[PDB]
């Protein structure tokens, strides 16, 4: 089994910059290497074949080079749409193995999140559940903190967070925080707060409600 090591695993680059991915083979695979681009929710897309040959329709900013054991893939000037995971592959000897991928992230200006809290709906209460959903939309960078100060006391149980894939247009991340608990647990307290601690502001963005307003 010919092992392929792709480097780096992750990459952050601004629109207009140049980026190079390297692909190393455990043994000589001549020029039988292909490069694939896969955007979220889509099948892989062939960009470069035969190490250095551009596939039909692919832009001139994408290039590949190499022979034997060392292979390179280059984007001369990155576009906002180039956000994807990039794979190399050897096809010199079976089984035809892929690299581990390189996830390409886009650098943009720092963005403060639009925060919004949501009380459990009457229809969920009916079922015996109580989920408090806090949305944190369109921010940069991805690194963000959420604290749940229920009546001044912190809560770490039932809190589930989920980041969106980076936006292909404006390069931003969105993140949901959900505090799930039982109906009667929701009924025992009153003030529910989700606070967003982010590097763009020392004073965290607060959003709160009371059970009956």
């Amino acid at each position: 089994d010919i092992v392929i090591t792709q480097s780096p695993k992750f990459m952050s680059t601004s629109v207009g910059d140049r980026v190079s991915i390297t692909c190393k083979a455990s043994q000589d695979v001549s020029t039988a290497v292909a490069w694939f681009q896969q955007k979220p929710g889509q099948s892989p897309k062939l960009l470069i074949y035969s190490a250095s040959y551009r596939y039909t329709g692919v832009p001139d900013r994408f290039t590949g080079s190499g022979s034997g054991t060392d292979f390179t893939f280059t984007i001369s000037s990155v576009q906002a749409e180039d956000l994807a995971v990039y794979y190399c592959q050897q096809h010199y000897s079976t089984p035809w193995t892929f690299g581990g991928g390189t996830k390409l992230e886009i650098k943009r200006a720092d963005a403060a999140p639009t925060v919004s809290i949501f009380p459990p709906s009457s229809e969920q209460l009916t079922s015996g559940g109580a989920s408090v959903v806090c949305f944190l939309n369109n921010f940069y960078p991805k690194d963000i903190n959420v604290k749940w100060k229920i009546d001044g006391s912190e809560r770490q149980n039932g809190v589930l967070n989920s980041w969106t894939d980076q936006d292909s247009k404006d390069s931003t991340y969105s993140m949901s925080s959900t505090l799930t608990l039982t109906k009667d647990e929701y009924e025992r307290h009153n003030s529910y707060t989700c606070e967003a601690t982010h590097k763009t502001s020392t004073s965290p963005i607060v959003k709160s409600f009371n059970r009956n307003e």
Partner: protein
């Protein structure tokens, strides 16, 4: 154009078998191999094997030689892959692919088939409307198994300010949410509906968000 159309998502029990299909169109089916490729979130991409439709000639990755069986039916222009003795390690998105000219292998891809191997029960989602210039509206999609669920807003008409988040698995049930930011003048004056589709349970739920 050349097109590869794969079958819908499957939930299958550990130890059982599943058979996935890849319908080809826009070319001579017996002229090309049909390749199968495995995709796990933390494992990357793996080539399983090919079938040559007509003869039914076959080639496998050593890794999959006992696990996978590849066939093709020339009359319906569809290739198949059967996976036997299933483990959670077989849970993956499975693709079919086809090569182009000479050295342009894996040029054409299928859309993928999500296979979930689990003993857990198929459960439909419970969908809850989330209500509170621009106004952010939400939609809570809770307690379903297995993946996936597709969420559209106004039947995909308000796909501008939408942020649908990846689901989280908790004790054999998935839950996700989708937010949509719309101008304050539009809501509540014009209606907003969250459309939720869950293929496994063959359930569709439309939830109008209200003040």
């Amino acid at each position: 154009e050349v097109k590869l159309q794969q079958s819908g998502p499957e939930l299958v029990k550990p130890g059982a078998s599943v058979k996935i299909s890849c319908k080809a169109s826009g070319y001579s089916f017996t002229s090309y191999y049909i390749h199968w490729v495995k995709q796990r979130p933390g494992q990357g991409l793996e080539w399983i094997g090919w079938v040559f439709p007509g003869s039914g000639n076959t080639k496998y990755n050593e890794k999959f030689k006992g696990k996978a069986t590849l066939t093709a039916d020339t009359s319906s222009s569809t290739a198949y892959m059967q996976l036997s003795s299933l483990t959670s390690e077989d849970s993956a998105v499975y693709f079919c692919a086809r090569g182009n000219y000479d050295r342009a292998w894996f040029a054409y891809w299928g859309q993928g088939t999500l296979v979930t191997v689990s003993a857990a029960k198929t459960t439909p989602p419970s969908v809850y409307p989330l209500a509170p210039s621009m106004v952010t509206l939400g939609c809570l999609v809770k307690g379903y198994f297995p993946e996936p669920v597709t969420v559209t807003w106004n039947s995909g008409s308000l796909s501008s300010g939408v942020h649908t988040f990846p689901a989280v698995l908790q004790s054999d049930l998935y839950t996700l949410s989708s937010s949509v930011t719309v101008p304050s003048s539009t809501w509540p004056s014009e209606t907003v509906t969250c459309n939720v589709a869950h293929p496994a349970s063959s359930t569709k739920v439309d939830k109008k968000i209200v003040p």
